[PDB]
Amino acid sequence: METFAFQAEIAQLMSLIINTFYSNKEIFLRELISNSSDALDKIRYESLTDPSKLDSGKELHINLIPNKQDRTLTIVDTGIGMTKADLINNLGTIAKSGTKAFMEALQAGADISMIGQFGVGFYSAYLVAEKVTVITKHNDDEQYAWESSAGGSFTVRTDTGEPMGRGTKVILHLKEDQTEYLEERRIKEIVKKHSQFIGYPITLFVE
């Protein structure tokens, strides 16, 4: 396990998301499903030129997995996934410029719900989660685990868990007062409101 420091801008954004009073927290799911859909578009598009891109799995889908025992909501996709270089470097560049643009817009009067327009909608996970674990597998790299509870750092290690084939798992370790996002009726309601026309099958698992 390797530990990395967030740049000051992204650390400030994570603190704003955690500390700001903002009741419309449900938008985190729209943001994560949108990132999953974008990752699925990306591998689908690459496969149009190189069909072997799907040797790591033909199914293009999104699964929503609640676990009341662990207090986790997991979003699974069979999209493009992220390499080690994506997790540490490439996405750090995106997070930096996206945060700057979002913070400027927020000071001007934009709302937290508009976070996705800045390419940093992933960080809306911290509206409901005290810790986020990302398990990911990209065709060009090994399976990795990225994780952060904010506090200014994140970790990256090769993941020894169940081999995914290709894609991303976003594990949301929910805050104690955010357990409504583990309830079937609540997740169904949110998906219907914000994500009813996503071009991939979204399966809401139950317990």
Ligand SMILES: O=C(N[C@@H]1c2ccccc2-c2c(-c3nc4cc(F)ccc4[nH]3)cccc21)c1ccnc2[nH]ccc12
């Ligand atoms: O949401 C994704 N990736 C997000 C993302 C987005 C924007 C900025 C940063 C990050 C990010 C990061 C990340 N943020 C960083 C911020 C830094 F300061 C330095 C390195 C960083 N790495 C780590 C894991 C996952 C993601 C993502 C990508 C592909 N397939 C996916 N399926 C579901 C989500 C998902």
